[PDB]
């Protein structure tokens, strides 16, 4: 749950902060967290949906890291960032729709979907970011 908020907070900030022409020092601490996120999420596969008419989608993460060598972010960096962000946003959208749809009488505060039970490991704990909402 903490890492799901962290994924969404980094994707929100990386849609906000990583824009065309912005200075690198404005985004120098966000690109390191987004690269830590890519490094953590590679090699892992997920499966979302499977209840009602929510379709089963399989998620595979094989992405390269973002560059840390620009002074002002040009449009190449923005386009490859928008690709990686759109894939992760679709992933977290389907994980959130897989988690809001499930429930349990026994212990409801625990994650119920398979994807969020897989994200609740300490392998994914280095995704974690600020919890400000």
């Amino acid at each position: 749950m903490d890492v799901l908020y962290s994924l969404s907070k980094t994707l929100k900030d990386a849609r906000d902060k990583i824009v065309e022409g912005t200075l690198y020092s404005n985004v120098s601490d966000l690109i390191q967290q987004f690269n830590q996120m890519i490094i953590t999420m590679n090699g892992n596969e997920f499966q979302t949906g499977g209840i009602g008419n929510l379709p089963i989608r399989n998620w595979n993460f094989n992405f390269g890291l973002l560059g840390t060598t620009l002074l002002n972010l040009d449009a190449n960096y923005v386009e490859t960032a928008r690709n990686t962000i759109d894939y992760f946003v679709d992933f977290v959208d389907n994980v959130c729709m897989d988690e809001m749809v499930r429930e349990s009488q026994r212990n409801g505060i625990a994650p119920q979907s398979d994807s969020l039970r897989k994200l609740s490991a300490i392998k994914f704990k280095r995704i974690n970011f600020d919890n400000s909402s």
């Binding site: 690198y24 690269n35 002074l71």
Partner: protein
Amino acid sequence: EHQKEVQYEILQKTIPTFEPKESILKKLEDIKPEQAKKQTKLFRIFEPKQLPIYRANGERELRNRWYWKLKRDTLPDGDYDVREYFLNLYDQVLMEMPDYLLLKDMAVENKNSRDAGKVVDSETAAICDAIFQDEETEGAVRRFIAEMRQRVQADRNVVNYPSILHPIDHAFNEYFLQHQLVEPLNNDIIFNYIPERIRNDVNYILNMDRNLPSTARYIRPNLLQDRLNLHDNFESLWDTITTSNYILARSVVPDLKELVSTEAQIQKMSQDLQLEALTIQSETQFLTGINSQAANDCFKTLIAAMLSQRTMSLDFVTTNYMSLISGMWLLTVIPNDMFIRESLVACQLAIINTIVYPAFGMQRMHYRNGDPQTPFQIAEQQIQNFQVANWLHFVNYNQFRQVVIDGVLNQVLNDNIRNGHVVNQLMEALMQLSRQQFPTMPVDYKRSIQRGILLLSNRLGQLVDLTRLLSYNYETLMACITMNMQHVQTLTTEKLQLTSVTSLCMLIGNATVIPSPQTLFHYYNVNVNFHSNYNERINDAVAIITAANRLNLYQKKMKSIVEDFLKRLQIFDVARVPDDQMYRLRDRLRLLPVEIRRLDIFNLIAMNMEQIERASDKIAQGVIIAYRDMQLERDEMYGYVNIARNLDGFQQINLEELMRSGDYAQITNMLLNNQPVALVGALPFITDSSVISLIAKLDATVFAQIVKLRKVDTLKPILYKINSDSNDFYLVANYDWIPTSTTKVYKQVPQQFDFRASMHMLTSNLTFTVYSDLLAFVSADTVEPINAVAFDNMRIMNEL
């Protein structure tokens, strides 16, 4: 064997270890800490200089004016080389930059002051004098120059001194004054600087026998962790690092004291296990009994390999069975992580096929290498004893246990090895193999191997105490580890002779050897110095790489930065690094954030690239070619001059990209068909004081060689600095023509000297003292080593 050495040499050519393996210790002990640097000057990029001015008709006025002229204007030509020079200036600032600053040592007397007065540099004293002497500065200013006063407070440790600096130079010096890397030292920081195991050991007695004033200061070593994981993918670099830490830890472990007299031990082992009755040979079984070259060096080898996480390999003779019987104790004390996999399984399979499977009547096993199960691990699932099985199940899963202690990861034994209690089970499993009749072995070899086991199984306490001592030396030297203890299977292995293990078994006495606190501190000194060196170099490397990439230097060849990087760690042979690890060390340094200090200096230099470049007087940054008679501009600097304020309205053609491409295509077109254009570059110019050269239209003639040569390197255009001193000036003065010129040299005028925006009060401390050693202030004694105790407060070397 001539094939074997050349294959090992083909493997060794890709490993940066130095070929004298002992010599690395010198190159590892001569890493001094980075000495605290103090500055004696005030880093003046600019200086004020008197220049003659020309009152906007040509006539040189009767006075001069102070201007900010950049001293040492070694600015090169072209857009690329100028910002390469700014990177050279960046490196020069990084190597010039002091840690701490005391302005009182730079303070010099203010010669005009009506009280005493102290300015903070000889050059600001010269500027102060020259602004006081002349007849054209303000009365409030000239009065004030002999009325400004330093503020030196003996309490609070502050000084304030006036200075006449440029705002750029003031930015650099105030950065050097605010951020200092110096901070207070007392007895309650030296007490935390020593490791935790030594703080809470009763064997070592440490206190403070020296006073520390409030003006005692130091520098942190920056003992931050790796940031570049050298252990997973830099296998040939990790080999070099484990060899260097191995030869370091070998020279720190203590020599063994009061061993068994070797001749009585050799005669006892030669009469108990008899070999003149048997027939394999007589002598080679007994290369064991060496006093110091076998047992002591085995002790060194074991503890140095365990401390440096250096993988070992087992050398033995299979018919030499006493080496395997001592290898049983080697396998129970050392974790099986340490030994390389093939040597581990080979010696393990030798011990099992020659001793343990002939014991219980079982057929010898065929191993089949491809399984993940070691021969003890199959053997215990095939052997039901409850005495040998205890031992086998210990050795199957003794391995190191990864835990951070005070940040650093450490590879620790379990507590059964740690207090030596596990040997009480190995000897129970060994004298079970001694009352064991073998079903079809010949009786002389059987009696010999049973008495050879009884050679070991009668040294119960003598080896319980030895693996207490070995583990305690490993404890006290593991506390002074400051990098991670990463366990990765290295390429080259330190070959262990099991003859040395039999020597260490059969020759130890009961005399405790523990590291004395001077060689226990010295190991910590060289570890902290290598780690400090390592982090400060990585910070320098990511600074130079990030600076060279933000300054658009792509002929930079970052492999050269990484080669000059690995030379400075002083343990690597840089010419032997493979190219894939070199390029991966390149693309791993680029994912690192710059140190805040380096990044602040790059921000100080990057925004002031334009002010330093455009006040150079050697170069001019581009030429307008307008092909219409734009009029000569009046300037107080130069008289009449064709200087340009903006490159607006026209075409900025980049001359650097024009030099790169080489297709021209455009400046050829716009030069042949006479079209207005603004060449942006960093060209040098011809200053020219002639009205005849102004009438003869000389500037249009310096551009045809761009399309003749197809090179923009030789472009030297012409600035029209005409004045009353130009000795053709009468044509300007006597005739009624309007001063016109075809092309313009785009240049910035230098900034004039304003005393209000240049006087500054600089603030620092007064008379502290930095301390580099930090461990000579610890007075260090030890309990008498007959009374040395373990973690459990029971005495190691019980045997007395």
